[PDB]
Amino acid sequence: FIGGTSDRPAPISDKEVDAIMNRLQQTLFEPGEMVRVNDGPFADFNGVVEEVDYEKSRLKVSVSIFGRATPVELDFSQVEK
Amino acid sequence: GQKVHPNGIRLGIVKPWNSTWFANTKEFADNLDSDFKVRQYLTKELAKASVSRIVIERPAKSIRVTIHTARPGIVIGKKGEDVEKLRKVVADIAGVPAQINIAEVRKPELDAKLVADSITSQLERRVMFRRAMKRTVQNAMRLGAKGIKVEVSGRLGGAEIARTEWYREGRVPLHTLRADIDYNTSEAHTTYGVIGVKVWIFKGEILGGMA
């Protein structure tokens, strides 16, 4: 246990238990921001936000592929901020 | 009568496009307008550099301009300075970053544009039209043109009534699509108006095509 002394470990508190139980019971990709991807073959690459796929809960981030750095669209889960 | 532009009819068969890029309808016109402005500026700035062909490509968000010239040293300048300034202003015109490459045309006398420019410059600099055009054919045939034709037209020597005259050596088959006929044109602004010069140079046929 974690307490003042090893002979007698101590409880937490009266209200601490209540707070822990209270919790136990109870972000926008700005255009122009430089991002990294979270998954896929393009995961963890230096991309830069190019447009806003906002109401789709999606994304589109420019990346540097075959010199034709292509307009590349990603899921919203693919951000790294 | 009226004849089709040789390069126009042969484009895609034995001739390449001067501009080679893809663009959707949203930016095709913008690309064409930028191309026109860039070509105009470069042609005027390099009027005395014997520039033969300006190939504009648009890789991604950049523009690569290749200048085919017969005088690379003038265009380049000491240690690339002139190329640098041309690039720095082409980037301004295009908006996107720019890169410039220089391609030498080894034998300018077989280049239609350069031949037309020479004849036009001579006419403006007061020379006999017959002498000038005959001298360019002789030089073209000497350097090995399979065929050549020059046509001067309009108030030759200050004559009141404009006339058209043309020389032609070798063979210049303009109805043969597989033929390689480099054709270009020039206008000489002289004290008595505009004198048009058309030059066809036939430099062999292409069977495999290769577009």
Ligand SMILES: [Mg+2]
């Ligand atoms: Mg017709």
